[PDB]
Amino acid sequence: AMSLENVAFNVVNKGHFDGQQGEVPVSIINNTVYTKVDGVDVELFENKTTLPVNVAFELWAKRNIKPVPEVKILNNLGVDIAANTVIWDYKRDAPAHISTIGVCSMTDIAKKPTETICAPLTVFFDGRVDGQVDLFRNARNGVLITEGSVKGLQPSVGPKQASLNGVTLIGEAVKTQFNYYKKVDGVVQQLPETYFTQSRNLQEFKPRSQMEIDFLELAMDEFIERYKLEGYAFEHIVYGDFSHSQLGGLHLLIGLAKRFKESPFELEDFIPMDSTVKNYFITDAQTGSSKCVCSVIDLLLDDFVEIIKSQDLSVVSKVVKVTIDYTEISFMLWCKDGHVETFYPKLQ
């Protein structure tokens, strides 16, 4: 017995839709959902989606409040829809997927993932919910996350971090590292050997290794000496060249974080969404060095060192494909006389 006023009552009394009975008075003005609290209207939700306000409100209220995979992982694994939940995209303030299965009467394409309409879609299944591993086994397409082993099914250990209510974190009081499974046309697919992005913020960047601790602490010349990175263009790629009108390199988040402590810079996120490789219009505030499209990836510095040191340096131009977050990321490797000139997450 779903209603706007019942969804609103749940938001007001439980913090989210908890299936409790009751109604509060609601008013909808434009794209904002308000409720009457002691004579005056209080804003409950601002529609930042392309869906009708009341519809978005319901999906936001019915959002999954358990640690879930980050939208980039779900996209990289080809997920189209979720089974009886709403994965909320906090980077976009909108549902991660267009339609729902057993969530909202307006967005539902089916009540159960077993309906023939879900067969061609990659449905996301959560093994922590009862009967969802069995629904994955019966699905034609899908992705499954589990906390433990599923007999017979070969696991793929996912990232240490997961998104809990928009807060990406490595769980201590909750499990955030999941086993991942994928199915394409009824056939379980072997998920590749992958690297994971660290999902760190530029503002609250924290090193997750001795190499990362030495990068932020030591000077450029002593770090490149200690970790024997001579001839790998770390000065351009990781550190960034701010001497010309076009900002050179700066494609690793740890390098952006090191610079950020010395001087600020504008990072214009012109495509705001969760992505393995993020593109930014960077403008350095100190020098005035800028780049319209600066591809930035957040790999662990040890993983990025391993990737670049595992390359053949004898070709002038070469595309280097690296599996990161289950997706193949093409990099552009430019060499000269057996040394790296540039290495960057390939644009276009």
| Active site members | 236, 251, 291
Q: How many CA atoms lie within 13 A of 314 on its CB side?
A: 1
Site string for a copy of itself, 164-203 (x = CB under 8 A): xxxx-x-xxxx-x---------------------------
Write down how long the chain is. Answer: 348
What is the residue type of 93? D
Residue 149: partners with Cβ closer than 8 Å, 6 or more residues away: 155, 179
Site for ligand WJD in 136-165 (CB under 6 A): 136-137, 150, 152-153
For residues 283 to 302, the per-residue mask of contacts with ligand WJD, x marking binding by CB under 6 A and - elsewhere, is --------------------
102 CB burial (10 A radius; 0-12, 13-18, 19+)? middle
293 in a known ligand binding site: yes
- Rounded CA-CA distance 242/59 in Å is 45
Which partner, ligand WJD, a copy of itself, none, binds residue 286 by CB below 5 to 8 Å per kind?
a copy of itself
Binding partner of 194, given ligand WJD, a copy of itself, none, CB within 5-8 angstroms per partner class: none
Pair of tokens at residue 213: 């601790």
Q: Which is nearer to ligand WJD, 28 or 153 (CB)?
A: 153
Q: Does the annotation place 345 within a ligand binding site?
A: yes
**What residues from 115 to 134 belong to the interface with ligand WJD (CB under 6 A)?**
133
Dist CA 329 CA 340 (whole Å): 19
Please say whether the beta carbons of 284 and 242 come within 8 A: yes
3-class secondary structure, 138? helix
Q: Which of 4, 188, 273, 320 binds ligand WJD (CB under 6 A)?
A: 188
Q: Which span sits near a copy of itself by CB under 8 A: 277-285, 311-319, 322-330, 332-340?
A: 277-285
Contact footprint for ligand WJD (CB under 6 A): 133, 136-137, 150, 152-153, 183, 186, 188
